[PDB]
Each structure stands twice: as C-alpha cells, then as structure tokens.
Design a protein around this motif. Structure first.
Motif, PDB file in Angstrom:
ATOM      1  N   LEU A  13      59.454   3.904  23.344  1.00  0.00           N
ATOM      2  CA  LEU A  13      60.887   4.169  23.723  1.00  0.00           C
ATOM      3  C   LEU A  13      61.071   3.869  25.213  1.00  0.00           C
ATOM      4  CD1 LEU A  13      62.204   7.385  21.852  1.00  0.00           C
ATOM      5  CD2 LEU A  13      61.387   5.109  20.910  1.00  0.00           C
ATOM      6  N   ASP A  14      60.009   4.149  25.961  1.00  0.00           N
ATOM      7  CA  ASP A  14      60.080   3.996  27.429  1.00  0.00           C
ATOM      8  C   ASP A  14      59.859   2.516  27.780  1.00  0.00           C
ATOM      9  OD1 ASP A  14      59.842   4.246  30.146  1.00  0.00           O
ATOM     10  OD2 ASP A  14      57.711   4.986  30.057  1.00  0.00           O
ATOM     11  N   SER A  15      60.851   1.645  27.517  1.00  0.00           N
ATOM     12  CA  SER A  15      60.604   0.216  27.584  1.00  0.00           C
ATOM     13  C   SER A  15      60.454  -0.265  29.040  1.00  0.00           C
ATOM     14  CB  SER A  15      61.721  -0.564  26.816  1.00  0.00           C
ATOM     15  OG  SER A  15      62.976  -0.207  27.349  1.00  0.00           O
ATOM     16  N   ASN A  16      60.899   0.525  30.017  1.00  0.00           N
ATOM     17  CA  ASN A  16      60.686   0.099  31.453  1.00  0.00           C
ATOM     18  C   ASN A  16      59.476   0.737  32.115  1.00  0.00           C
ATOM     19  OD1 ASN A  16      61.685   2.691  32.062  1.00  0.00           O
ATOM     20  ND2 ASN A  16      62.920   1.989  33.836  1.00  0.00           N
ATOM     21  N   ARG A  17      58.734   1.504  31.328  1.00  0.00           N
ATOM     22  CA  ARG A  17      57.425   2.058  31.754  1.00  0.00           C
ATOM     23  C   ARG A  17      57.558   2.951  32.926  1.00  0.00           C
ATOM     24  NH1 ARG A  17      54.691  -3.872  31.814  1.00  0.00           N
ATOM     25  NH2 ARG A  17      55.907  -4.502  29.930  1.00  0.00           N
ATOM     26  N   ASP A  18      58.511   3.819  32.991  1.00  0.00           N
ATOM     27  CA  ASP A  18      58.596   4.792  34.073  1.00  0.00           C
ATOM     28  C   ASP A  18      58.267   6.195  33.609  1.00  0.00           C
ATOM     29  OD1 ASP A  18      61.022   5.494  32.804  1.00  0.00           O
ATOM     30  OD2 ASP A  18      62.328   5.077  34.444  1.00  0.00           O
ATOM     31  N   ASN A  19      57.799   6.299  32.367  1.00  0.00           N
ATOM     32  CA  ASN A  19      57.385   7.605  31.791  1.00  0.00           C
ATOM     33  C   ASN A  19      58.484   8.556  31.495  1.00  0.00           C
ATOM     34  OD1 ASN A  19      54.486   6.911  31.895  1.00  0.00           O
ATOM     35  ND2 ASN A  19      54.819   7.035  34.168  1.00  0.00           N
ATOM     36  N   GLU A  20      59.687   8.019  31.415  1.00  0.00           N
ATOM     37  CA  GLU A  20      60.852   8.805  30.993  1.00  0.00           C
ATOM     38  C   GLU A  20      61.689   7.964  30.054  1.00  0.00           C
ATOM     39  OE1 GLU A  20      62.533  11.858  32.707  1.00  0.00           O
ATOM     40  OE2 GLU A  20      61.714  11.693  34.705  1.00  0.00           O
ATOM     41  N   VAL A  21      62.471   8.651  29.215  1.00  0.00           N
ATOM     42  CA  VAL A  21      63.455   7.937  28.365  1.00  0.00           C
ATOM     43  C   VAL A  21      64.807   8.192  28.906  1.00  0.00           C
ATOM     44  CG1 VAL A  21      64.467   7.817  26.035  1.00  0.00           C
ATOM     45  CG2 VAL A  21      62.013   7.996  26.330  1.00  0.00           C
ATOM     46  N   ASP A  22      65.474   7.133  29.390  1.00  0.00           N
ATOM     47  CA  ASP A  22      66.808   7.264  29.887  1.00  0.00           C
ATOM     48  C   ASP A  22      67.889   7.060  28.823  1.00  0.00           C
ATOM     49  OD1 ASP A  22      67.258   4.380  29.742  1.00  0.00           O
ATOM     50  OD2 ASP A  22      66.449   4.128  31.730  1.00  0.00           O
ATOM     51  N   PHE A  23      69.147   7.280  29.207  1.00  0.00           N
ATOM     52  CA  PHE A  23      70.230   7.208  28.177  1.00  0.00           C
ATOM     53  C   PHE A  23      70.267   5.864  27.424  1.00  0.00           C
ATOM     54  CE2 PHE A  23      74.490   7.291  26.110  1.00  0.00           C
ATOM     55  CZ  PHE A  23      74.398   8.489  25.462  1.00  0.00           C
ATOM     56  N   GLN A  24      70.050   4.767  28.144  1.00  0.00           N
ATOM     57  CA  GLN A  24      70.125   3.463  27.530  1.00  0.00           C
ATOM     58  C   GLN A  24      68.943   3.301  26.519  1.00  0.00           C
ATOM     59  OE1 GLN A  24      70.998   0.027  29.995  1.00  0.00           O
ATOM     60  NE2 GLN A  24      69.639  -1.303  28.834  1.00  0.00           N
ATOM     61  N   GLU A  25      67.739   3.681  26.946  1.00  0.00           N
ATOM     62  CA  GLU A  25      66.583   3.643  26.065  1.00  0.00           C
ATOM     63  C   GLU A  25      66.794   4.526  24.827  1.00  0.00           C
ATOM     64  OE1 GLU A  25      63.773   4.790  29.066  1.00  0.00           O
ATOM     65  OE2 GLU A  25      63.005   2.769  29.389  1.00  0.00           O
ATOM     66  N   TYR A  26      67.442   5.686  25.016  1.00  0.00           N
ATOM     67  CA  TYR A  26      67.740   6.584  23.898  1.00  0.00           C
ATOM     68  C   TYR A  26      68.732   5.950  22.961  1.00  0.00           C
ATOM     69  CZ  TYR A  26      70.509  10.588  22.043  1.00  0.00           C
ATOM     70  OH  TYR A  26      71.305  11.511  21.364  1.00  0.00           O
TER      71      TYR A  26
HETATM   72 CA   LIG Z   1      62.054   4.601  30.806  1.00  0.00          CA
END
Ligand SMILES: [Ca+2]
Ligand SMILES: [Ca+2]
Ligand SMILES: [Ca+2]
Ligand SMILES: [Ca+2]
Lengths: 14, 91, 88
Positions: C58-71
C-alpha cells in the motif's frame, strides 16, 4: 492518470 | 457489513446500475456516465453541466481511449472526488 | 438519498478515524492501518507477516506510511476485486 497507473500497479501486487 | 464495506459495495452496484443500460454492459458510455453523475453525484457536478465541459471530463476519465469509462477508470474518478473532499477535511 | 455520495463520505471519514492516533495525523502508520483493516474491512482479512506485506504494497512511495491517496488507490483495488466477482 498517475492514479490509473498506481491502481494498475497495486492491483497486480495484491 | 461495516460502513466501509457497504461503501465499496455501493461503488460497485452504482456503476452496474448505469453500465448495464446500453451496449457493453460493463462500461459507461456518454449517456450512462451523464445519468450517473446527474442522479448519483449531484453535489459534485457543477461546471460539467455544459456539454463541452462534460465531454472534457469524460475524455480525462477515459485514460485508455476506448470511448467508455470502465470500472477502473470510474474508481479513479471517485478517488479524485474523495481526494478533493479530503483537502477540505484536512484544512 | 444519494448512496454514492454517502459512500464517498465514509471513504474520507474512515481514514481520519485512524490516521490521527500517532505520528502524522494525516497518514496511517502500520499500527493505524492494521486497526483500520481489522475494524472496518474485516471481510478482506491474519498474521503480523500478512499485515507487513500488505503495508509494503500500500505504501507505494516507501515512506512507511499510507497516505490518503495511497488509501484511495487501495480502496479502488478492493472495489475492483469485488467487481470482478460481480461480473463473473
Ligand atoms: Ca506512503
Ligand atoms: Ca454500457
Ligand atoms: Ca476507457
Ligand atoms: Ca498517523
């Protein structure tokens, strides 16, 4: 879209 | 089902309510997309009332250029509306 | 009633029910995502290793968080899975 591309990327992973 | 599961189910069902009306029962042509936006998303359709503006929206949604909006393209559309509204939540 | 507009409101509000607990209040860390999935999408679920490969994806930008767009990209994919079943 960047979004369409991202959807296709993720759907192929899940 | 829980609220978010029901929301997903409504996304799917609402699409087929309109996609199955004419031709390819699994894609939205121009008349089907128009009827979905007008009936189902009236809060969000504003500028798109104009025919040329609606056709522009349509040509932006149709990212694989086959003249219709398929379910993936429709999800991207809905996600763009959600991201629009989320700007307002975050402030 | 506009069920699709109600759906959209749930998609936005559900994210913020969880993303505010820790760290960036607009992103889901792995703990916040596990809560969200367990409580809000139970039909789509599991071990901790399973939550981790899902997090990674889910974390497609690899920052270790899921943001609204990724969600939203994730929810589109889950709707697409249900749609493929619906279509037959
Ligand atoms: Ca992310
Ligand atoms: Ca159709
Ligand atoms: Ca298309
Ligand atoms: Ca957070």
């Amino acid at each position: 879209d960047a979004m369409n591309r991202e959807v296709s990327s993720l759907k192929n992973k899940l | 089902a829980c609220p978010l599961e029901k929301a997903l189910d409504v996304m799917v069902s609402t699409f087929h309510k309109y996609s199955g009306k004419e031709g390819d029962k699994f894609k939205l042509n121009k008349s089907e997309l128009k009827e979905l936006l007008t009936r189902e998303l009236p809060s969000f359709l504003g500028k798109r009332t104009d025919e040329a503006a609606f056709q522009k929206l349509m040509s932006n949604l149709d990212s694989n250029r086959d003249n219709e909006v398929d379910f993936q393209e429709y999800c991207v559309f809905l996600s763009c509306i959600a991201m629009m509204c989320n700007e307002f939540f975050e402030g």
